Amino acid sequence: RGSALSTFKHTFVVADATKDMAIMYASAGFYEMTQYGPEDVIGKNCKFLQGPGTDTEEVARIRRAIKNGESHCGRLLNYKKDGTPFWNLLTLAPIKNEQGAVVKFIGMQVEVTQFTEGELEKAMRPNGL
Amino acid sequence: RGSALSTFKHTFVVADATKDMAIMYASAGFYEMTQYGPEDVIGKNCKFLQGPGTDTEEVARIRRAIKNGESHCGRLLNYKKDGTPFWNLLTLAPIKNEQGAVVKFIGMQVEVTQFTEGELEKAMRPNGL
Numbered sequence: 694r695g696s697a698l699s700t701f702k703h704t705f706v707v708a709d710a711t712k713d714m715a716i717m718y719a720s721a722g723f724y725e726m727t728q729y730g731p732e733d734v735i736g737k738n739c740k741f742l743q744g745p746g747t748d749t750e751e752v753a754r755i756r757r758a759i760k761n762g763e764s765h766c767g768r769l770l771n772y773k774k775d776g777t778p779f780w781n782l783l784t785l786a787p788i789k790n791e792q793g794a795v796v797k798f799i800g801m802q803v804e805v806t807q808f809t810e811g812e813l814e815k816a817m818r819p820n821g822l
Numbered sequence: 823r824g825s826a827l828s829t830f831k832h833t834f835v836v837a838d839a840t841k842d843m844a845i846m847y848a849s850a851g852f853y854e855m856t857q858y859g860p861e862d863v864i865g866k867n868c869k870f871l872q873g874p875g876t877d878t879e880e881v882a883r884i885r886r887a888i889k890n891g892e893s894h895c896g897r898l899l900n901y902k903k904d905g906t907p908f909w910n911l912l913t914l915a916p917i918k919n920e921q922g923a924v925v926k927f928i929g930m931q932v933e934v935t936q937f938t939e940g941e942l943e944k945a946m947r948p949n950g951l
């Protein structure tokens with residue numbers, strides 16, 4: 694779901710389009726998923742998460758989305774502070790003013806884990822039994 | 823966020839990998855976003871949403887994800903029952919048994935709308951003021 698949003702429940706960052714898309718904000722979930730702290734993250738471009746085997750063509754689609762002011766999603770290999778790799782389903786959306794110009798982007802990250810048959814059944818079942 | 827999941831809050835479908843990826847389940851949000859009903863959706867492949875200008879190369883990445891049993895996200899133009907186009911950020915994840923084989927896929931759809939500066943500030947602000 695997502696794109697109400699909550700800085701305490703959800704994993705997202707906000708980039709300043711006035712500032713070469715530097716991170717100007719990160720949610721609690723971001724620090725928790727990546728293991729980085731505000732002193733590492735704020736003011737940096739979010740590509741410090743990228744590393745060996747990060748797909749160059751997915752990065753290029755992200756870049757084009759950003760350049761065009763479009764929403765976008767893509768799967769990217771990323772790395773936590775301790776070097777652990779994870780798959781990140783990254784959702785991006787532009788934020789505009791009234792002038793119709795992009796002032797910021799929000800990126801929502803999802804760390805892919807295994808969804809098992811058991812947990813899916815519970816979601817599908819329309820009650821609490 | 824997403825990939826607990828709720829059939830009443832979230833927009834998703836579940837496909838049966840035993841059945842040429844026919845939809846075997848759809849959430850309340852799916853029927854509400856697409857305007858289709860269970861009598862249209864259940865048993866069909868979800869490409870009835872695709873239409874003019876749906877990107878062929880995004881569809882091909884989805885197909886490859888499905889074939890490889892990988893999670894995936896991508897932005898796809900889709901159409902509601904009344905013909906209205908919408909951008910769908912589609913997230914896909916495989917569901918496996920214990921044998922380690924893919925029995926189902928879950929797809930979570932997000933209809934892209936405008937995120938405004940005002941609603942973003944409220945999300946970022948760490949309180950209810």
Ligand SMILES: Cc1cc2nc3c(=O)[nH]c(=O)nc-3n(C[C@H](O)[C@H](O)[C@H](O)COP(=O)(O)O)c2cc1C
Pocket residue numbers: 706707708714738739740742743752755756759769771781783785798799800801802
């Ligand atoms: C709001 C936002 C969030 C982003 N989050 C991530 C992220 O979680 N992981 C990642 O690898 N790249 C992320 N990116 C992409 C990188 O910051 C960067 O835009 C991409 O690598 C292209 O950089 P370049 O054009 O300088 O090469 C994000 C971008 C934005 C605007």
Ligand SMILES: Cc1cc2nc3c(=O)[nH]c(=O)nc-3n(C[C@H](O)[C@H](O)[C@H](O)COP(=O)(O)O)c2cc1C
Pocket residue numbers: 835836837843867868869871872881884885888898900910912914927928929930931
């Ligand atoms: C669980 C699941 C959900 C899907 N949801 C959507 C959807 O919301 N919109 C869409 O255009 N395609 C969706 N697809 C993709 C199509 O069903 C189909 O897999 C894709 O068009 C490739 O079809 P083909 O290999 O038969 O050409 C979904 C697929 C799965 C497995």
